Design a protein around this ligand. Structure first.
Ligand SMILES: Cn1ccc2ncnc(Oc3ccc(Nc4nc5ccccc5[nH]4)cc3)c21
Ligand SMILES: [Mg+2]
Ligand SMILES: [Zn+2]
Length: 315
């Protein structure tokens, strides 16, 4: 498996399209791992990692994604691609070590996701909720990454110094924890505060960490920044999984919130519009303000929002 991956070269007809924010990995399933290789080479250099160790890592990450409807291997690569495009349009603002870490983090941010929310696992007293009280799945996701890195021939940061190793693990740690949507609101409120007061300093490490946190959220939800046909199909995958979580509550004899209730299928468009306005728009809006080149994401988000309006209005 990892043998054929090293030989892979990306089709030339996709060299300029892959750089676009709205790029859809959808119809390139068996190219996905090589696409991640491509992106890492272009953003961090070809002589950044040993190819063998990197390919072993990608393949092990792949297999440790469960066959769930949304939080699966495809989602990982999609989030990784969004991050790539962000980093490519903001060349100088991020260090070499941050580029390596963030792309790895995006690929690993949902490792061994069971298809259940933190809310579900905490309610029903899951061993993972017993272990990690808050940001349950996210701490597991990172745990999983560490385990994979500590496998033989999988340590892709082996060439980095002892000091550089513990720095990139912290960058990875924070980026993955930040993908907990519950933490997003506080983060974005703080970043908006700093912008309008003009107290935002990118020399400030804790300010850097916050900006990165927002980038993680923006990449995580980047399905809303694709073209309407792609976005609509991704919406189907999210709800299929949400509804599967809903069914598991019904089997336990407990009625789930309408978001996860499949009998509330009609209220999906209204739920979507609400989500775009409350969560998606402010996200990409604040990100655009901090990183102006990321504007095509906001533009793309506005487009889809208006499409859900047409749905609600029946057009
Ligand atoms: C996580 N995620 C990543 C990308 C992405 N794209 C779209 N939706 C996402 O997640 C949701 C899904 C649903 C809701 N709300 C909701 N309210 C409802 C009320 C009734 C019925 C369904 C309802 N659904 C909010 C967020 C996405
Ligand atoms: Mg997650
Ligand atoms: Zn995710």
């Amino acid at each position: 498996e990892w043998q054929g991956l090293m030989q892979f070269t990306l089709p030339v007809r996709l060299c300029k399209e892959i750089e676009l924010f709205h790029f859809d990995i959808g119809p390139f399933e068996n190219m996905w791992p090589g696409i991640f290789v491509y992106m890492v080479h272009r953003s961090c250099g070809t002589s950044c990692f040993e190819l063998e160790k990197l390919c072993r890592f990608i393949m092990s990450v792949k297999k440790n994604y469960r066959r769930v409807p949304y939080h699966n291997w495809k989602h990982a690569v999609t989030v990784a691609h969004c991050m790539y495009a962000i980093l490519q349009n903001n060349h100088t603002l991020f260090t070499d070590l941050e580029r390596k870490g963030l792309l790895i983090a995006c690929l690993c941010h949902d490792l061994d996701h069971r298809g259940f929310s933190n809310s579900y696992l905490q309610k029903f007293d899951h061993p993972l909720a017993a272990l990690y009280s808050t940001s349950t799945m996210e701490q597991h996701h990172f745990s999983q990454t560490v385990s994979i890195l500590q496998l033989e021939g999988h340590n892709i940061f082996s060439t980095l110094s002892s000091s550089e190793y513990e720095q990139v693990l912290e960058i990875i740690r924070k980026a993955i924890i930040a993908t907990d949507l519950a933490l997003y609101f506080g983060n974005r409120k703080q970043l908006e505060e700093m912008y309008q007061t003009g107290s935002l300093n990118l020399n400030n490490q804790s300010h850097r960490d916050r900006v990165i946190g927002l980038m993680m959220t923006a990449c995580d939800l980047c399905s809303v920044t694709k073209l309407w046909p792609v976005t609509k199909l991704t919406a189907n995958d999210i709800y299929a999984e949400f509804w599967a979580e809903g069914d598991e509550m019904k089997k336990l004899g407990i009625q789930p919130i309408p978001m996860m209730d499949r009998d509330k299928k009609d209220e999906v468009p209204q739920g979507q519009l609400g989500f775009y306005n409350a969560v998606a728009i402010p996200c990409y809006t604040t990100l655009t303000q901090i990183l102006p080149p990321t504007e095509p994401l906001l533009k793309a988000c506005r487009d889809n929002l208006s499409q859900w309006e047409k749905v609600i209005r029946g057009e």
